[PDB]
């Protein structure tokens, strides 16, 4: 299924030692099978290129379950693409019968972080969580970061 | 869409008339509208209505019926068929070549078309000659 003329064997055939050397022939396994031995005769290769192999840092959690750390993330950077931008122009006349209502857990997200630099309208954000800067940089604009259940 | 340069880079190499022959670096089209039979870009089946050629006859020897391009009344989405028109000069072996320069002025094939009608009129002739030697 792979175009063989561009493979080297179509081309190296036939000069004699097939690209692998007269002195230092292509033998079976001249260094070790696999990660042998990254602690004796491959150690330079294993630190560089992978510092941190060969130890134990520690706290064992027998049977981690991947729900107790779920918490999907969203910054204030989006937050307003979740309502339409075509529903951003109308509150940008200016006219504030709004903040809107954003229910970030109905979308998929829990943690509202604060990267952001979001506009001067208020928002009403029902998410399950907070950043310190998500609470500030919303309530400065008027609205409120609110707890989803 | 349709332009003779987009049409040609699709056709340039994967053609069905181009039939290159074995040393000669990439030429020959066996087209019915080529008149200098290589494959250039502007000797070609469809180059979109610069498509003139020179055909005999049907009656050998007098004619050369000339399929003149059937032009820009056509897209050339086809025509309730028109697009080959076949005005065929006759009757004088070296007057009609003036009457082909006189006919068309599409100055790109012009000296390579009456270069062909001559080379048909060179060929259809030789019946009552090449005889006796008594």
């Amino acid at each position: 299924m792979s175009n063989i003329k561009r493979k080297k064997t179509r081309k190296l055939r036939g000069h004699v030692s097939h690209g692998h050397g007269r002195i230092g022939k292509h033998r079976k396994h001249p260094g070790g099978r696999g990660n042998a031995g990254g602690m004796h005769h491959h150690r330079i290769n294993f630190d560089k290129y992978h510092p941190g192999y060969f130890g134990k840092v520690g706290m064992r959690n027998f049977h981690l379950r991947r729900q107790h750390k779920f918490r999907p993330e969203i910054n204030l950077d989006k937050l307003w693409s979740l309502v339409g931008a075509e529903k951003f122009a109308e509150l940008e006349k200016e006219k504030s019968t709004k903040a809107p209502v954003i229910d970030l857990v109905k979308f998929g997200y829990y943690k509202l972080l604060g990267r952001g630099h979001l506009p001067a309208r208020p928002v009403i954000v029902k998410a399950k969580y907070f950043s310190k800067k998500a609470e500030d940089k919303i309530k400065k604009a008027g609205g409120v970061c609110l707890l989803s259940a | 869409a349709t332009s003779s340069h987009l049409n040609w880079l699709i056709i340039r190499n994967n053609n069905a008339f181009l039939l290159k022959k074995r040393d000669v670096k990439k030429p020959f089209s066996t087209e019915p509208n080529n008149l200098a039979s290589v494959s250039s870009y502007r000797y070609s089946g469809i180059v979109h209505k610069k498509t003139l050629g020179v055909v005999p006859a049907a009656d050998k020897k007098g004619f050369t019926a000339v399929l003149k391009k059937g032009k820009y009344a056509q897209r050339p989405a086809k025509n309730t068929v028109r697009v080959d028109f076949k005005a065929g000069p006759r009757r004088s072996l070296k007057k009609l070549k003036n009457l082909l320069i006189g006919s068309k002025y599409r100055k790109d094939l012009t000296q390579a078309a009456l270069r062909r009608a001559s080379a048909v009129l060179r060929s259809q002739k030789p019946a009552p000659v090449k005889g006796k030697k008594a």
Partner: protein, 49 residues
């Protein structure tokens, strides 16, 4: 840009029938790019099934 650009495709019927009053417009796939390099690369692969 256009979708129209040659915007009348006549319909024909069994007796070679140029004439209808039905003249439908060129349906705008026919301006989209011809790319034989991607067609050949989808064809290479899809007929391996």
């Amino acid at each position: 840009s256009l979708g129209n650009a040659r915007p009348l495709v006549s319909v024909y019927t069994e007796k070679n029938e140029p004439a209808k009053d039905k003249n439908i417009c060129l349906p705008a796939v026919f301006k989209a790019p011809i790319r034989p390099d991607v067609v050949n690369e989808v064809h290479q692969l899809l007929r391996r099934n």
